[model samples]
Target chain A: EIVLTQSPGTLSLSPGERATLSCRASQSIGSSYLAWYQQKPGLAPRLLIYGASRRATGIPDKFSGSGSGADFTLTISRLEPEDFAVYYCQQYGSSPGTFGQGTKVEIKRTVAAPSVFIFPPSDEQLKSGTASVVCLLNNFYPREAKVQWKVDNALQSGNSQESVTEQDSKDSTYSLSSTLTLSKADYEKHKVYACEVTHQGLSSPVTKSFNRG
Target chain B: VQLVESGGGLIQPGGSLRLSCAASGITVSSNYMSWVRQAPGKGLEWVSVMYAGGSTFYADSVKGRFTISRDDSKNTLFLQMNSLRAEDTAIYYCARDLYSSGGTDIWGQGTMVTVSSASTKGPSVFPLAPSSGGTAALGCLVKDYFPEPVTVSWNSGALTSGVHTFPAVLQSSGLYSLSSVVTVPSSSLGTQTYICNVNHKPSNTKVDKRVEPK
Candidate 1:
């Protein structure tokens, strides 16, 4: 079975922005075949391109594919926020076909909404100081939930944290909160952190960088 | 890979024998498996076969009394034959059946299984005694060369078809024997003649027979 990998879970782009997506196959699919699809809210997925370079019949000319061999790219010349859903690449050359992990394009909004952030921690934060991060979900129907922290994209082993839940019981709305406490050095430069929340069939991951005082 | 017969001999008049095929190279668990038999001077008989997922298909002639099983973890196929008789003597082999171009296309190396040192037994014939309006059972046994898949049809004054099954028994040498049985009723026994046809590969046909109710 071939393994597919994707990058940058979320991309923020302005209207008319040129966007590029990448998908890599574990093994060379040389001439086997590659296809891409776009999925939107409540509608069946439509084929965007097939056999790598050939666009499926009735697909908009705005979408184009360019790349060869193991490396290939899918480019949309003009990006509309409507195109801001999930895109996936699939390879059918081998038995037991595989699909790339999905990438989501979200509109970047500014708000101090218990944001989960990621960045290299500063040396001062690494000096045995206590550091904490929170994640918040906005514009979402229920508001009560839990937050999880991941180190280097992998869940930290044997670490337990606090959780807070708030719910709009009338509207069946829910939200959750989780906190991670680590030594200043642990959150220092080059260390990455992610705060993820699990909701009905969906997970929102937030990352942040720590700066020393 | 390769399979060899057990170094043993049989001497019992009603004993049976069995042979096994062990595989090598790529794992056998990844491929389909089949067992075919070729008598010393005859054509190929599709005994029975199975797939990696445990699905099995036996020749219409050899359905019952015969079982084909494999150990994917060990890459070996165990072929057990029961109800052995001198007539069951033949070279048995196993092969890999592969699917290609939307059809089965590849076969594995065959293992030759032979039954030896058994006392010579005369042909045993069952005479068909017909009743005025009742049915008679005619038994036709034919031995031929041509290692290919074939079907048997019964014809007297009219043509009739019967079902076939394999029976399992122990040979004199303490080995298992694989045998097929087919029965025809008297209503189709008018001519007192039945043909046991063997279909050969490479586009050739060879048939032999026995007549009954004479």
Candidate 2:
């Protein structure tokens, strides 16, 4: 088994600047059996380079791969606004092929902090004795973010909540939805339900609460 | 939840092979069943996926050459691949995809497939240089073997040194070829038979050639 690690977790760059991403392998990757991909939110990954240095069909000339053995590099001659997404490197030379965690190419500027909102359960849900509370975070920058739910100030188990994060293509920002479902009896007993959100753009966690009127 | 892959073993190049995965403790039609394969010593490749709603999607690499189907009542998913080649030799696994988890949850014990061909045979040995008073050399050529790791020796374990085996090189035909050289003292050339032995493990083949110098 081989492990691939992509360095420079977050690459801050501007349009027209060269972006170089590195992928280091745990063992030798002979014959340049590596590939690179550009992934944007809510879309399939686009292949950039294959066989180490060969650009994929229709791929721009600016995207190139170089290096061999255990170290490889993917360089973008000039950054395009559309290229400000996450990039990943994969190795096919060894079994159980591995992929680098990912490198985010973000525009360097003041990050956007998501606005939070809490929506209480609907009357129909309350009638069913089980209700779902929704917490929405919108317009956040750089996809690395998380959300946790608290019941009466006590942290709830992760399994008790369903969370999803997606990019808003219009603004290149992200929106997340975290939902907590429980019996109406449990909700009334707790009296307070809070959604705690964290992102690179914020100095501290943001908490939004909801309760019965 | 367990996944068991079966019905795939050997296929001749340009032929077709049928493989199936039987999933237990779960409903086959409730989730997406995907086929993933890894070539010998290479990373994984996603071939296709069979969705719960009976829709099928294939990777561009295998789009036309591979077909995926499923039988929910039998709790099994089947894959039929056509026009197989030596490069298609790999271990095939069936994985269950989580709709929202962004990955697979359970995987079947992969079944190995070997696209057998005439190239799996032994190598060809040729006498490179006649005994020139000082030494004699022989060359052994192994070609068209897939998933290569061939062993070359001289004199059937009697002579270990003076043997040079080069790394395998992939040919445009999608197979690999390599050469090995052996040298022996000229003084013993005529008195002894210089033998070059070639062994390809994956195909379980062996070829031995002997040159008796006059």
Question: Which prediction has the highest lDDT against the true structure?
Answer: 2
CA deviation > 4 Å runs, candidate 1: A109-213, B1-214
Docking class of predicted structure 2: incorrect
- Give a tens-digit lDDT track for model 1, residues A64-106: 8766566667787676646756666655454323456656654
lDDT of each: 0.47, 0.69
TM-score of chain B of each: 0.45, 0.56
Question: How much lDDT does candidate 2 score?
Answer: 0.69
Cα lDDT tens digits for candidate 1, B134-190: 423333321222222234444422354322312222333443222122344546656
Candidate 1 residue B93 Cα shift, in angstroms, is 44
